[PDB]
Write a protein that binds this ligand. Sequence first.
Ligand code: HEM
Ligand code: HEM
Ligand SMILES: Cc1cc(N)nc(-c2ccc(CNCCc3cccc(F)c3)cc2)c1
Ligand SMILES: Cc1cc(N)nc(-c2ccc(CNCCc3cccc(F)c3)cc2)c1
Ligand SMILES: C[C@H](O)[C@H](O)[C@H]1CNc2nc(N)[nH]c(=O)c2N1
Ligand SMILES: C[C@H](O)[C@H](O)[C@H]1CNc2nc(N)[nH]c(=O)c2N1
Ligand SMILES: [Cl-]
Ligand SMILES: [Cl-]
Lengths: 362, 362
Amino acid sequence: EEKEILWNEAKAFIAACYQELGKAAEVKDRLADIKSEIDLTGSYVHTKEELEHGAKMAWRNSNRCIGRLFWNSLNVIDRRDVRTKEEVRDALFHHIETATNNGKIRPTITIFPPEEKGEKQVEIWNHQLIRYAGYESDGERIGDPASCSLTAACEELGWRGERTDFDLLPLIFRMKGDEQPVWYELPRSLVIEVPITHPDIEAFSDLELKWYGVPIVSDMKLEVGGIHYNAAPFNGWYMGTEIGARNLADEKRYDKLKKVASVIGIAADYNTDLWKDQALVELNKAVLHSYKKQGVSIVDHHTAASQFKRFEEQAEEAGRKLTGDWTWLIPPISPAATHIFHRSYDNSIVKPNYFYQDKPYE
Amino acid sequence: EEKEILWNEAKAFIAACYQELGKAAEVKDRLADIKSEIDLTGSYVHTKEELEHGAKMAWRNSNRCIGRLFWNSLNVIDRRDVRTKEEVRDALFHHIETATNNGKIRPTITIFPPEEKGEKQVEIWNHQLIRYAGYESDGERIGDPASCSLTAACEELGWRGERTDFDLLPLIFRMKGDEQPVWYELPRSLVIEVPITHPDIEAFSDLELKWYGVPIVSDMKLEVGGIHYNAAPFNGWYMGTEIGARNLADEKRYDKLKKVASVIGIAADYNTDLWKDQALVELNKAVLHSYKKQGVSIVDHHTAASQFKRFEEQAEEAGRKLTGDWTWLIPPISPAATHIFHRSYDNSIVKPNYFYQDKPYE
Ligand code: HEM
Ligand code: HEM
Ligand SMILES: Cc1cc(N)nc(-c2ccc(CNCCc3cccc(F)c3)cc2)c1
Ligand SMILES: Cc1cc(N)nc(-c2ccc(CNCCc3cccc(F)c3)cc2)c1
Ligand SMILES: C[C@H](O)[C@H](O)[C@H]1CNc2nc(N)[nH]c(=O)c2N1
Ligand SMILES: C[C@H](O)[C@H](O)[C@H]1CNc2nc(N)[nH]c(=O)c2N1
Ligand SMILES: [Cl-]
Ligand SMILES: [Cl-]
């Protein structure tokens, strides 16, 4: 029935994996046992080596990611042994700690048990492990509007946020068998935050802006060789523009450009003054400066693009087809200043890969 | 043979044209005669009304153009009567004058005789009627590199440029029957140029930057109802970013960002300083300021995007499908600050339209 599609994707993944690993002769025998195990059990189990390389291939294949140069040094943590919510919680806690690494961020992924019959063993509700709540009630807007629905779902479960603009959401996830997810408050000792100051303009601190150190995406599905790891949070370090040009700048997010314009001392009255553009630049300089000053890893969009160029060169020379999403790879500020803007990319989907999946709330 | 495809496109265009013009009942009779005229002659001739509306529909359908809100007030000049190179030259001269309009730019198109049997009556070599030459010889780079090949072709024809960074190319075009194009120097009295100064930073004039007032694209084909107007130059006013973010900024164009960084007094040493982004913003403020100060029409990318939003609303309410090229509609600076960035567009080709065509040089 579905062993068909499972077997096909297994054949493709194992062949490619073992080839890249220099283990091409072990394929037919490895494929043999797998083909067998699928018949009796309806599935198969990745070795640690396969799972680790699959996770790395998935990152390499993420069309929208500019950071892909470092795909091969991803730190893979195999947590397929977890059975309890305490183990899940502690695995998420450790991921935060080890990835943060006192500010010298380690690109890391923690992999939980995969879907069995399409049945989730663990269902993580958070978009990112560290993320700020958002509230909207009777005209009143607080925090991160992108978090409004998860925040409301959290508050249905007994949690209550302090309603600052930067409430840390609890971890929230559901175990197979349980009807409701559980939630656990984040130990603040584990969460590095960076207050936003500007190198030249002292008044910038009057904005009282901050962001969290480590983006840890926890709601995408890792697909490896027909196996569906629906719960597999992964992190890197930020590209400054994600914070300065979007999270803090978008009208539907924190919407800070008018306030930025004010503290840097320019008028926000005329489009021709390009006050939004100027504000975007100073806000983005502030973000890079602040992360650097605090000893927290971050990359600017120019360096990131230069790295991606090397990713392109590396692919070609390894004889691998390159795929990418131009509309996502271009940075939201000065895009024509990067080589990305001036070439095209094939947006084909190659597996292994990370995929969106339906949210349990909403 | 090809009367087939000609008749099909005629049927589609006339129906749509006459409908939009409120002349739906005149269609079948108009279509009748056209169907007849195609049989005897192999072609058909647009009335002035049809040609004018077709040109406007072509602009409305240009997926890559952010300026489309004003499609319906395009000024159409019908020059299908020209027979001689003197008439062509004088028609091009007049187009420049009337479109410029002392700085209050009028979006205008001059339409020359269409292709007959696929045979061009008039073949315009210029990319734009007003454009700067470019030279590259023995390491030495002068002027606009995008113009290198046309400039070389011009210099094969007896013309010689002064080799400043802003040599105005002559008009160059070929008449049916002639083996070589002719060229005519531009009367400087007709060409408005704008020196680039900055509102706040006096040193900016040390760069001695300038650009021409009016972009007049002269190498695209207007297609209307199966008729191919290969020679039909059209102009609007500039969006500032075309000049400040591309023509003056691209490494393969005038490459001025390092010099901009210097005169505005910032270092150009570290990517994390975002010095390119800052330079782009000040250069783009300078361009808008300078055009405004001189009384020459121009639009900033924010106003232009707001206008385009109205173009979208106007389309919907008129029951017309909207088409666009997202990768071209987004401006090359602060794109995420415009609504364009945050929605998608169907990039389907609708006719009438303007099309690239093969260059006669090169
Ligand atoms: C090491 C530093 C990294 C940087 C600077 C980086 C940069 C980025 C950026 C800027 C985006 C766009 C996000 C957005 O605009 O919403 C992105 C998307 C993405 N990145 Fe990376 N990334 C990094 C590491 C990683 C890692 C470790 C993985 C997984 C193993 C990964 C997989 C992805 C995926 C799947 C997306 C697409 C998310 C979506 O479509 O919503 N990246 N990356
Ligand atoms: C009125 C002011 C106008 C503005 C501000 C404007 C703006 C623009 C801009 C910024 C581009 C992108 C060019 C590039 O990046 O290389 C563009 C492309 C285009 N515009 Fe407009 N435009 C205007 C008027 C017109 C008119 C009058 C027509 C024709 C009747 C036209 C047809 C087009 C076409 C065909 C393109 C695509 C050129 C290509 O693909 O290379 N536009 N427009
Ligand atoms: C590993 C990693 C590093 C880094 N610097 N950034 C990320 C990251 C950031 C944001 C996102 C989220 N992208 C958008 C998801 C989305 C898509 C559609 C609608 C929405 F509201 C939200 C994914 C990955 C991931
Ligand atoms: C009417 C009008 C107004 C305005 N503001 N801009 C233009 C305009 C500007 C530039 C262009 C040229 N676009 C790129 C053509 C091209 C395409 C591919 C390769 C190349 F080297 C050049 C076309 C229209 C046209
Ligand atoms: C409509 C458009 O495709 C969409 O809003 C995209 C555009 N490019 C993007 N690129 C990145 N990196 N992140 C985004 O959220 C978006 N938004
Ligand atoms: C590769 C890419 O499609 C191409 O270089 C485009 C990108 N978007 C653009 N958009 C505009 N307006 N003008 C351009 O020249 C380009 N270049
Ligand atoms: Cl984020
Ligand atoms: Cl131009």
